[PDB]
PDB file of C-alpha atoms in Angstrom:
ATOM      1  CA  UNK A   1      24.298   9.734  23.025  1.00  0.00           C
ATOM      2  CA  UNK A   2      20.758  10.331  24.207  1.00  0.00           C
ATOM      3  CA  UNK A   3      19.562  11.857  21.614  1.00  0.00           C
ATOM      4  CA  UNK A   4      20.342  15.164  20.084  1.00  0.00           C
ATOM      5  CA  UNK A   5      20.151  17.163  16.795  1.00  0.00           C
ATOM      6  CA  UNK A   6      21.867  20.039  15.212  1.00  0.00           C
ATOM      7  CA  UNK A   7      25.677  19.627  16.689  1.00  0.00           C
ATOM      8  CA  UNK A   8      27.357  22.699  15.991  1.00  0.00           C
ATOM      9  CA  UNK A   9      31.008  22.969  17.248  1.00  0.00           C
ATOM     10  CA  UNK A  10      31.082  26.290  18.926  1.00  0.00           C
ATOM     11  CA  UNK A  11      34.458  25.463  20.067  1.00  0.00           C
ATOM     12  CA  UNK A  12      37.810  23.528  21.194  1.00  0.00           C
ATOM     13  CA  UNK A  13      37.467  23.305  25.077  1.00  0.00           C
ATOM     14  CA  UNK A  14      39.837  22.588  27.324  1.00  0.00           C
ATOM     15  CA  UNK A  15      39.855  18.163  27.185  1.00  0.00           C
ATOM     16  CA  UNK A  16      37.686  18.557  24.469  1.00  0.00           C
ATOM     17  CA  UNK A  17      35.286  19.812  21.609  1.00  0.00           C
ATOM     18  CA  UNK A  18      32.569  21.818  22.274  1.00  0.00           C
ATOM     19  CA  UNK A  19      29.006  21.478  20.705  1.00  0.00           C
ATOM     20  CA  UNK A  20      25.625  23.459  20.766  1.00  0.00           C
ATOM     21  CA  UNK A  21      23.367  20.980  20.132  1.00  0.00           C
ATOM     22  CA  UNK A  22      18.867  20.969  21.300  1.00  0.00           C
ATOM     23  CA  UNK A  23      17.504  17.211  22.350  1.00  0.00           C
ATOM     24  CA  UNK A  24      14.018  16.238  20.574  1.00  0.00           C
ATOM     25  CA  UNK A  25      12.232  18.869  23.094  1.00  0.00           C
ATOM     26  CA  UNK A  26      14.008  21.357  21.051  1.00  0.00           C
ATOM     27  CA  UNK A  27      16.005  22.736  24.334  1.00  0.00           C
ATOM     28  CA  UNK A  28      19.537  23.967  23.643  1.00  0.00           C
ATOM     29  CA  UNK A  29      22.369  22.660  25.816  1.00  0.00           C
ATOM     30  CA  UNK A  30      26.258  22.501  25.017  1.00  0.00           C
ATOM     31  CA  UNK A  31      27.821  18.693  24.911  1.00  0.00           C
ATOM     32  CA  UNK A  32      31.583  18.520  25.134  1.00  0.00           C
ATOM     33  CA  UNK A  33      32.950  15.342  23.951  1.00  0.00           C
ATOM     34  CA  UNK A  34      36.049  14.201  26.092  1.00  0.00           C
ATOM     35  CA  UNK A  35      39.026  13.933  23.940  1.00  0.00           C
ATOM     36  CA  UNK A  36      40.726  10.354  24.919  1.00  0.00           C
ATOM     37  CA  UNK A  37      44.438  10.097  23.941  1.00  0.00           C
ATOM     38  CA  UNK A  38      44.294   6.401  24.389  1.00  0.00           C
ATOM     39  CA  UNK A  39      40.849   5.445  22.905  1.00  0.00           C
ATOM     40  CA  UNK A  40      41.251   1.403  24.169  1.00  0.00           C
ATOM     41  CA  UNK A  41      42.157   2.645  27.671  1.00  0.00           C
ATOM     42  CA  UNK A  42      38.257   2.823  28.532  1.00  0.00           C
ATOM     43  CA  UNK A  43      37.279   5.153  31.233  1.00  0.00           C
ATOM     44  CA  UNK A  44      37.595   3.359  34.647  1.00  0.00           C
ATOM     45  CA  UNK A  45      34.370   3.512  37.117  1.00  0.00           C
ATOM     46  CA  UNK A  46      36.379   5.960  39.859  1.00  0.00           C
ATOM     47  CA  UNK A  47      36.425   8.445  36.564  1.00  0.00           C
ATOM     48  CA  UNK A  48      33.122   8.655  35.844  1.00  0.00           C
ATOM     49  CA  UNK A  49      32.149   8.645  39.803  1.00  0.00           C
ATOM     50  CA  UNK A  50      34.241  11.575  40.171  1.00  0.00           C
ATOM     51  CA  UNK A  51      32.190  13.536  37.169  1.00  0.00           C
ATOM     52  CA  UNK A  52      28.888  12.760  38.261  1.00  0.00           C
ATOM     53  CA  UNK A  53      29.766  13.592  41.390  1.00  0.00           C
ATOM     54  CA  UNK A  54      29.734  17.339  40.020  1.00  0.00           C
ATOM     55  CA  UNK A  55      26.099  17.142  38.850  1.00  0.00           C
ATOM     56  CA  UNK A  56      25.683  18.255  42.512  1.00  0.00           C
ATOM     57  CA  UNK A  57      26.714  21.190  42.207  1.00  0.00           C
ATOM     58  CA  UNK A  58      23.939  23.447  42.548  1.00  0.00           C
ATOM     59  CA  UNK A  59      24.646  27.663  41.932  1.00  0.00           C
ATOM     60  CA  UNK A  60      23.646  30.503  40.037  1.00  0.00           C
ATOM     61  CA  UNK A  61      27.261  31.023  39.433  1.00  0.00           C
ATOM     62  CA  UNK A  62      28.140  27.524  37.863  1.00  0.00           C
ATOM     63  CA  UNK A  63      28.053  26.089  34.997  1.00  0.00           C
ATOM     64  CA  UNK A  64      25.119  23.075  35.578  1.00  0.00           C
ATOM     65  CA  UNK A  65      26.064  19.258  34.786  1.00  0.00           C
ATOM     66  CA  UNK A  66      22.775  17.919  33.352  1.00  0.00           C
ATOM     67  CA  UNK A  67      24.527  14.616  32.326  1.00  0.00           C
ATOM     68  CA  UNK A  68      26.979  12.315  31.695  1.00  0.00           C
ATOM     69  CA  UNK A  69      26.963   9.897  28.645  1.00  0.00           C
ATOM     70  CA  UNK A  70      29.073   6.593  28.923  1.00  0.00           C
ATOM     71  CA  UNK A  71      28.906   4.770  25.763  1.00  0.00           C
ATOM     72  CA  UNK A  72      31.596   3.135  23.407  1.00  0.00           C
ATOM     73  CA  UNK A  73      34.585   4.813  23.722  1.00  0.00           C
ATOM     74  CA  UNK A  74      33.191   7.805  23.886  1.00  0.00           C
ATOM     75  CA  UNK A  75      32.352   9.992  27.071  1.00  0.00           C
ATOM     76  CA  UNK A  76      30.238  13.918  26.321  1.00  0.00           C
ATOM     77  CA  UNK A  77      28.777  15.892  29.273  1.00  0.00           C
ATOM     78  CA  UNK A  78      25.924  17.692  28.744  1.00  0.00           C
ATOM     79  CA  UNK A  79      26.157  21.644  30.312  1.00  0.00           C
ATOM     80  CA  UNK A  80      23.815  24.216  30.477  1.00  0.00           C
ATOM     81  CA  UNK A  81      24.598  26.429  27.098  1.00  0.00           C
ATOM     82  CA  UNK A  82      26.222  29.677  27.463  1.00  0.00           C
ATOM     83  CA  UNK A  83      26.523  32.020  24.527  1.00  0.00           C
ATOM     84  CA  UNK A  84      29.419  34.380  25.144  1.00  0.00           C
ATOM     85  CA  UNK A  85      32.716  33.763  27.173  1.00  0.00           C
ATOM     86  CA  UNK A  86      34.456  36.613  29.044  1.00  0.00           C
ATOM     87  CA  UNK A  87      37.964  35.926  26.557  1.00  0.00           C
ATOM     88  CA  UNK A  88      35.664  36.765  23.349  1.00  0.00           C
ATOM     89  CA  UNK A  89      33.975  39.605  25.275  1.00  0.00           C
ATOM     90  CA  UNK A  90      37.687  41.223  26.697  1.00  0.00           C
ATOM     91  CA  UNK A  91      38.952  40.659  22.593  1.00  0.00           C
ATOM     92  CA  UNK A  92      36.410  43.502  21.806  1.00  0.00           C
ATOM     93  CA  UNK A  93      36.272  45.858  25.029  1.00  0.00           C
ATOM     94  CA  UNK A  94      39.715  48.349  23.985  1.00  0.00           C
ATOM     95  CA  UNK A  95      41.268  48.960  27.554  1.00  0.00           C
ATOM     96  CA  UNK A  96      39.331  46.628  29.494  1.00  0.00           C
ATOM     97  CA  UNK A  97      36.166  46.452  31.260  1.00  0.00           C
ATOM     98  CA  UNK A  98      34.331  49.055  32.911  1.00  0.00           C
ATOM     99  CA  UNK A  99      35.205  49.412  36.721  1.00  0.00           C
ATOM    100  CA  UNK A 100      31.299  48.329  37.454  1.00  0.00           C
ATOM    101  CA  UNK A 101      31.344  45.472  35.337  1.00  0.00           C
ATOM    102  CA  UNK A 102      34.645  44.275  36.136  1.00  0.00           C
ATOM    103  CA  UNK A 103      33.262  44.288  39.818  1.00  0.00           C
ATOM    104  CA  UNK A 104      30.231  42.734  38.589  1.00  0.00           C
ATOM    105  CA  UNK A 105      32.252  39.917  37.035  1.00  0.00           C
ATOM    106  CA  UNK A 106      34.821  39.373  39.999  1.00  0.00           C
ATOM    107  CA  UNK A 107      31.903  39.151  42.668  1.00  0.00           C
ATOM    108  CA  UNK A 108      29.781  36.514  40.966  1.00  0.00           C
ATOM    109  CA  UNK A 109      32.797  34.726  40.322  1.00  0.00           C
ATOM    110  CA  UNK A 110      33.985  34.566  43.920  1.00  0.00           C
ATOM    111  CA  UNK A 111      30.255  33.085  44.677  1.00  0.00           C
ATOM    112  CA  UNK A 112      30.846  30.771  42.475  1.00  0.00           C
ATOM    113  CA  UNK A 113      34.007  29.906  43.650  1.00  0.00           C
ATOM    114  CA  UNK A 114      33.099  29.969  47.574  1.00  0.00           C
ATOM    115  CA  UNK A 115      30.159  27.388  46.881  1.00  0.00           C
ATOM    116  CA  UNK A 116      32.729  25.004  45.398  1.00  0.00           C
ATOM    117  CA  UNK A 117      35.734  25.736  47.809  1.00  0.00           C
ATOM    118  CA  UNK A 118      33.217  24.985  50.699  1.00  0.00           C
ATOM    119  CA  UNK A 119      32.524  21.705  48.810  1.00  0.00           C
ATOM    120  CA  UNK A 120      36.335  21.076  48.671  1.00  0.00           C
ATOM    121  CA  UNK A 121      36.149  20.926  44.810  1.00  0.00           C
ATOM    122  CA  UNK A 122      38.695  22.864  43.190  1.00  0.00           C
ATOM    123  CA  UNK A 123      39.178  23.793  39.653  1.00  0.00           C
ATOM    124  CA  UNK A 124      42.720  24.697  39.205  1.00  0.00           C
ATOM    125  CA  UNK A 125      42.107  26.073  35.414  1.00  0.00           C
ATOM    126  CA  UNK A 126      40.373  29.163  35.931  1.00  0.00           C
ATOM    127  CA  UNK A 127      40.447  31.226  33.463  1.00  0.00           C
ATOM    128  CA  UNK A 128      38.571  33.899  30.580  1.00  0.00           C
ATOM    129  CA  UNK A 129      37.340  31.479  27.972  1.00  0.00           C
ATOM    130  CA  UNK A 130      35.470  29.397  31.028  1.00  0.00           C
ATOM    131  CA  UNK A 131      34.202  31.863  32.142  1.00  0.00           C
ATOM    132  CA  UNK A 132      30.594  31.967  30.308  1.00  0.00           C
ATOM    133  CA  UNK A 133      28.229  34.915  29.704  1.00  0.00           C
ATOM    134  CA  UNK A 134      24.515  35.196  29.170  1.00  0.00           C
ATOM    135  CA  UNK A 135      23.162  37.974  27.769  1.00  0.00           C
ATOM    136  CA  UNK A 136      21.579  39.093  31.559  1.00  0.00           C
ATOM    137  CA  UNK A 137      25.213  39.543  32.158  1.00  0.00           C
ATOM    138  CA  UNK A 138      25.505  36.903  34.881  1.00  0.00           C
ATOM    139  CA  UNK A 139      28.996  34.640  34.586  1.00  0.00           C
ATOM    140  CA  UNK A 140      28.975  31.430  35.345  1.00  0.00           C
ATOM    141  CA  UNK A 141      32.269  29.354  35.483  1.00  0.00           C
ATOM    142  CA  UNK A 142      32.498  26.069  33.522  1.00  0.00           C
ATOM    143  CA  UNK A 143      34.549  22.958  34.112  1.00  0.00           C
ATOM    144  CA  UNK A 144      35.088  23.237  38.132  1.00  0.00           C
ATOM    145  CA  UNK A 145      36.114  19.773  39.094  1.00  0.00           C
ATOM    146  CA  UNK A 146      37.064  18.261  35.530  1.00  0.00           C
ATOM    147  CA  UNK A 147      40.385  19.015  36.942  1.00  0.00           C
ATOM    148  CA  UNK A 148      40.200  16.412  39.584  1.00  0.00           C
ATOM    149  CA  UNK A 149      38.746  13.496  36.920  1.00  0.00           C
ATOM    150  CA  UNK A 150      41.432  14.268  34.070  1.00  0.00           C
ATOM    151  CA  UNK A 151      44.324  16.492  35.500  1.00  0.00           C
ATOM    152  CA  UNK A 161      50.389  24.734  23.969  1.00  0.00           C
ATOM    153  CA  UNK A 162      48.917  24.619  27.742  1.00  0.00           C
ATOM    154  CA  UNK A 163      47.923  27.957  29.317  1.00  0.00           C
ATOM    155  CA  UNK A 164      50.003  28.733  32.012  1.00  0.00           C
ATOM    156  CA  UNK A 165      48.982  32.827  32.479  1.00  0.00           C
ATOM    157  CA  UNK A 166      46.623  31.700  35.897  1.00  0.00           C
ATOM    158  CA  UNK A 167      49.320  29.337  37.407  1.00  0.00           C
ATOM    159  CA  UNK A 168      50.174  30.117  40.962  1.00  0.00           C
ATOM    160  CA  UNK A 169      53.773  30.524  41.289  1.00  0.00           C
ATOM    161  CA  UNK A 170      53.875  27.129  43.980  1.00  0.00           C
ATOM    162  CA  UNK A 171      52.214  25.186  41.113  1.00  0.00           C
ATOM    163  CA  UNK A 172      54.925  26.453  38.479  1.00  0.00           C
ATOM    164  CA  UNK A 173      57.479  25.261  40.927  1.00  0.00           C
ATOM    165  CA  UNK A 174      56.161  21.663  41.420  1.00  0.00           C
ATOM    166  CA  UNK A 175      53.823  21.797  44.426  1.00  0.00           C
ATOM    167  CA  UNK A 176      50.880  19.160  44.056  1.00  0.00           C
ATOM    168  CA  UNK A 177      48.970  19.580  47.290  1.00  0.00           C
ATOM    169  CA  UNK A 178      45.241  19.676  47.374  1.00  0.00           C
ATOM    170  CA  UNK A 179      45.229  23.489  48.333  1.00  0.00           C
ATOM    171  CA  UNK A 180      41.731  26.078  47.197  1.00  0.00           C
ATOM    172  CA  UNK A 181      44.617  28.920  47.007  1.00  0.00           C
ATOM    173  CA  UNK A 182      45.419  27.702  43.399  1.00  0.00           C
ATOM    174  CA  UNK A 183      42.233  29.278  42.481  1.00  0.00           C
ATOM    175  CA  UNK A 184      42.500  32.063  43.954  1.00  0.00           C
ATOM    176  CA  UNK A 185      45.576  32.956  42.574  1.00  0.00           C
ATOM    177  CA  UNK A 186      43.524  32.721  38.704  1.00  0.00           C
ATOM    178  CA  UNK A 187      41.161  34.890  40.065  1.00  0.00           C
ATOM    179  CA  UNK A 188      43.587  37.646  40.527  1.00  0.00           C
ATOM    180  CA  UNK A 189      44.714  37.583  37.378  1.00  0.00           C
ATOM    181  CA  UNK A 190      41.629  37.666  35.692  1.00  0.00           C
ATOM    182  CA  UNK A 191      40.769  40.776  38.146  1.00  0.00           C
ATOM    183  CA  UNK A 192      43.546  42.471  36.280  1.00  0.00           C
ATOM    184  CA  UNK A 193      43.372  41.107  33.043  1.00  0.00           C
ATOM    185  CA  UNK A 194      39.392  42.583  33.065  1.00  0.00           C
ATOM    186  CA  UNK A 195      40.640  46.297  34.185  1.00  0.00           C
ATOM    187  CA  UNK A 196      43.501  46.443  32.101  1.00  0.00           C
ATOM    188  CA  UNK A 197      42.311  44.813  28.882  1.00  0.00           C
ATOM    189  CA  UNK A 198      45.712  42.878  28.330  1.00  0.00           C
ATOM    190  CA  UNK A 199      46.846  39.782  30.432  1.00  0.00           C
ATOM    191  CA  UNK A 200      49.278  40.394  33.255  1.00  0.00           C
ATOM    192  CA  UNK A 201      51.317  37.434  33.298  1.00  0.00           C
ATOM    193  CA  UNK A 202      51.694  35.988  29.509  1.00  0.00           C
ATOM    194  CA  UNK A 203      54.211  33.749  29.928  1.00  0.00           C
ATOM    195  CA  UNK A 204      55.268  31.322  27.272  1.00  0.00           C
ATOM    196  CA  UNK A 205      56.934  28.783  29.283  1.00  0.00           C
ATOM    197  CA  UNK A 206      57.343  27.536  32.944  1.00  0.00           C
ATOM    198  CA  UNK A 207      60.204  29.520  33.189  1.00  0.00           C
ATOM    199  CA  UNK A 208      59.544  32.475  31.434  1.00  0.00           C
ATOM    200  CA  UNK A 209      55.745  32.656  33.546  1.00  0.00           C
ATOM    201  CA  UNK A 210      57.971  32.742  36.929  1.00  0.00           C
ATOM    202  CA  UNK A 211      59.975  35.525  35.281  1.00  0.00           C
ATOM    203  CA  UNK A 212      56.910  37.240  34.726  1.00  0.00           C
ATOM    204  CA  UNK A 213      55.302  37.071  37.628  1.00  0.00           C
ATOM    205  CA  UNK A 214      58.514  37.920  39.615  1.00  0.00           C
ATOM    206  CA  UNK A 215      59.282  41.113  37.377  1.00  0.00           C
ATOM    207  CA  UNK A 216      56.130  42.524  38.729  1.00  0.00           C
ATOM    208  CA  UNK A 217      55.462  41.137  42.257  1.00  0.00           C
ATOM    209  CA  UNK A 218      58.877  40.532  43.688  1.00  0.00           C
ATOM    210  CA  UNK A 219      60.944  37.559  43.346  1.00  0.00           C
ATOM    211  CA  UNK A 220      60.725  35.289  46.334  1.00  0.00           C
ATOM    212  CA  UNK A 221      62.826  34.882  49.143  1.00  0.00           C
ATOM    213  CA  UNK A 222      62.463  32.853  52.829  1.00  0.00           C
ATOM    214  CA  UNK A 223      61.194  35.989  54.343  1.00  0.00           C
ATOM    215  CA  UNK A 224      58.262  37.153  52.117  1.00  0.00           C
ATOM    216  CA  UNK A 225      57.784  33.639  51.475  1.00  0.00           C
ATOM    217  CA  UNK A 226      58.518  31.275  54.146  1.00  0.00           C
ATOM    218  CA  UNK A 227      59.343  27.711  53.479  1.00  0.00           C
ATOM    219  CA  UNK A 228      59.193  28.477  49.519  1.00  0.00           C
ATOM    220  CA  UNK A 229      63.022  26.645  49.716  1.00  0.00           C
ATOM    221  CA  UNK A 230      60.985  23.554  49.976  1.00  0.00           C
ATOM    222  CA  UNK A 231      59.257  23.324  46.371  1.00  0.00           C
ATOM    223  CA  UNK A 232      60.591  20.796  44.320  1.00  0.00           C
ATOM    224  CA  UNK A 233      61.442  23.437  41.318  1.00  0.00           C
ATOM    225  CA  UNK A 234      62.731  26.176  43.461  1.00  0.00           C
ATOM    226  CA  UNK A 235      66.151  28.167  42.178  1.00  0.00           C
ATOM    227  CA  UNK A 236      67.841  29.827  44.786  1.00  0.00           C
ATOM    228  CA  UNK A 237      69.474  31.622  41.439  1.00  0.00           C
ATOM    229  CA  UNK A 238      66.296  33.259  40.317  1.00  0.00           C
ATOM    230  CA  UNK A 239      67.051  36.981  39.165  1.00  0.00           C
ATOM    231  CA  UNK A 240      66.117  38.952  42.404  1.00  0.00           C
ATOM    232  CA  UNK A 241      63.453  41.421  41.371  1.00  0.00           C
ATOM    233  CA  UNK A 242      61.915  43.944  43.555  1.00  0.00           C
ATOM    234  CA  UNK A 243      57.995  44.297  43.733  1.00  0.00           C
ATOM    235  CA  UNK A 244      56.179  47.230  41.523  1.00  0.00           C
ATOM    236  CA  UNK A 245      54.431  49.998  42.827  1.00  0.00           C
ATOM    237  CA  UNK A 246      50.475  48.614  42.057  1.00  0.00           C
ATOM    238  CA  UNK A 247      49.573  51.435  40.489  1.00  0.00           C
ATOM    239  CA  UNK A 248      51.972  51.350  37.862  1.00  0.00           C
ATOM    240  CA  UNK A 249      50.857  48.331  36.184  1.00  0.00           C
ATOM    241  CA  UNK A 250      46.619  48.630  36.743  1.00  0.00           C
ATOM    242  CA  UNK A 251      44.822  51.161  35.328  1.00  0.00           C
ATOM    243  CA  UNK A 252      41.202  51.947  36.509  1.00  0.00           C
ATOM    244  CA  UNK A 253      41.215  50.163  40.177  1.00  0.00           C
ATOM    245  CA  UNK A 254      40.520  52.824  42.736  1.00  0.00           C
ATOM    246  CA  UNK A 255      42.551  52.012  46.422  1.00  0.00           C
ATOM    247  CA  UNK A 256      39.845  49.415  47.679  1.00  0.00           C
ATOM    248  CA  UNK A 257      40.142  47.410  44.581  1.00  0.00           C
ATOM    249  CA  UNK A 258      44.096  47.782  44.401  1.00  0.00           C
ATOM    250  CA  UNK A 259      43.845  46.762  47.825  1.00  0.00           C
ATOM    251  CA  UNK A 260      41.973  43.180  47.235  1.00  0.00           C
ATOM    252  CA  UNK A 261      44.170  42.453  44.205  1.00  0.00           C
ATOM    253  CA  UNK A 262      46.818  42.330  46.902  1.00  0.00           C
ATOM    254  CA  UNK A 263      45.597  40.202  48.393  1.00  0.00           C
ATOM    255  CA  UNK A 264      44.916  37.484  45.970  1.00  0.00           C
ATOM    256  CA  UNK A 265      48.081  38.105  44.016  1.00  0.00           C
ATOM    257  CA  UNK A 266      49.981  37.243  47.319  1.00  0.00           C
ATOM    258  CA  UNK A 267      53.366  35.057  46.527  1.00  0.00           C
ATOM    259  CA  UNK A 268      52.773  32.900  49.293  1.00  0.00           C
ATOM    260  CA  UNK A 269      49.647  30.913  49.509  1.00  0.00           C
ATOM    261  CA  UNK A 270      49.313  30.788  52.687  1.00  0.00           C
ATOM    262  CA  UNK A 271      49.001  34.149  52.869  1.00  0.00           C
ATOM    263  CA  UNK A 272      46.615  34.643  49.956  1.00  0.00           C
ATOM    264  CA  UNK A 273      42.634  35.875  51.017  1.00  0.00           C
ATOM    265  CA  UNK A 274      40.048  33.324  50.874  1.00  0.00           C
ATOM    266  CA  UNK A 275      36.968  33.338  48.274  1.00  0.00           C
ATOM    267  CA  UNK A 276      35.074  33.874  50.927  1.00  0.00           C
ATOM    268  CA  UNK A 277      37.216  36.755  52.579  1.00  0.00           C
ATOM    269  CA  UNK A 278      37.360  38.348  49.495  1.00  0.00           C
ATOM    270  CA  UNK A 279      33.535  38.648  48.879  1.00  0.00           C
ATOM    271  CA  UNK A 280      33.772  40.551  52.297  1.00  0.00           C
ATOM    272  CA  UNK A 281      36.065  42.804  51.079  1.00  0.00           C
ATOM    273  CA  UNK A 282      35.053  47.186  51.031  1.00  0.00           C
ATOM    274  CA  UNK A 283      36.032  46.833  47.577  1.00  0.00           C
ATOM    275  CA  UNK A 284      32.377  44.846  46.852  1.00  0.00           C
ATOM    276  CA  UNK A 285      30.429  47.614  49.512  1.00  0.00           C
ATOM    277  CA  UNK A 286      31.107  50.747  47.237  1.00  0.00           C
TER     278      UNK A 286
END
């Protein structure tokens, strides 16, 4: 356990609970106890390799991994502690964000996510509620890499290649979250809130285009695929975000691209005009 005082669940994370909790320095850090379906299982060595691993992971714009305790059937990393999340902040700001701190928001979060991509560690999860706040107003993302260690879900930030079966390593999965939190921040209201594999496509495809082998190559070759999907034709971009001048339309383009191969980089984006104005 390594002793610490004062648990207060602050929340139910994503593989887990969430406590506040200060060591006997009186420091405050966040602990998040690793919910294990099969409690007898016992965490295997490559596991735990694969978490510590992400201790390494050194940026303004992360989350920091301070520790990992191992004891009894029981497994809690200890984060730097974070006091607001962007989903609690967007449930009181009517409309949205403010263009400025939207842009704020989506460039530290690209740095964040560059510094990882480069590292080849991909999240796959993005989105609001790990996104953490301080009260500077810097973001820092949470949970980057859990994804790789441990795989009613969420499925509003899943890439349309993931919905229809594709597994492959790829850092466009992220990027693909980003965009939607981009919009979800200027509108106020999420843009794709599905409520079932299915039903998320539809979504998606209402809005973007449904697609086809020549705005989306090879997209025949996903496992999930339906060459019956309702054919829908793409929205004018305008029409469905409110407050994005032409630069910042123009960079949601290009992370809400269909195919993935197509899709900007992290890195790309932060390049963008949109982040020069």
């Amino acid at each position: 356990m390594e002793k610490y005082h004062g648990l207060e669940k602050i929340g139910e994370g994503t593989y887990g609970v969430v406590y506040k909790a200060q060591n006997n320095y009186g420091e405050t850090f966040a602990l998040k106890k690793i919910r294990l379906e099969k409690e007898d299982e016992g965490i295997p060595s490559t596991t735990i390799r694969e978490i510590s691993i992400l201790k390494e992971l050194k940026h303004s714009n992360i989350v920091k991994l301070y520790d990992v305790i191992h004891t009894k059937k029981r497994l809690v990393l200890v984060f730097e502690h974070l006091d607001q999340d962007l989903k609690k902040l967007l449930d009181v700001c009517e409309g949205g964000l403010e263009s400025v701190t939207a842009k704020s928001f989506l460039l530290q979060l690209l740095n964040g996510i560059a510094y990882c991509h480069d590292r080849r560690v991909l999240h796959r999860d993005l989105k609001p509620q790990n996104l953490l706040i301080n009260r500077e107003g810097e973001l820092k993302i949470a949970d980057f890499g859990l994804a790789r260690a441990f795989g009613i879900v969420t499925l509003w930030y899943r890439a349309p290649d993931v919905l229809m079966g594709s597994k492959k390593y790829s850092t466009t999965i992220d990027i693909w979250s980003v965009g939607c939190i981009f919009a979800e921040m200027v509108n106020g209201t999420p843009l794709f809130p599905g409520v079932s594999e299915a039903d998320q496509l539809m979504r998606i495809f209402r809005i973007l285009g449904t697609p086809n082998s020549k705005n989306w190559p090879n997209v025949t070759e996903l496992p999930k695929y339906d060459p019956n999907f309702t054919v829908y034709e793409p929205l004018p971009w305008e029409s469905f975000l409110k407050g994005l001048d032409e630069s910042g339309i123009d960079l949601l383009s290009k992370m809400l691209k269909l195919d993935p191969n197509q899709r900007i980089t992290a890195k790309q984006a932060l390049e963008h005009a949109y982040f020069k104005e």
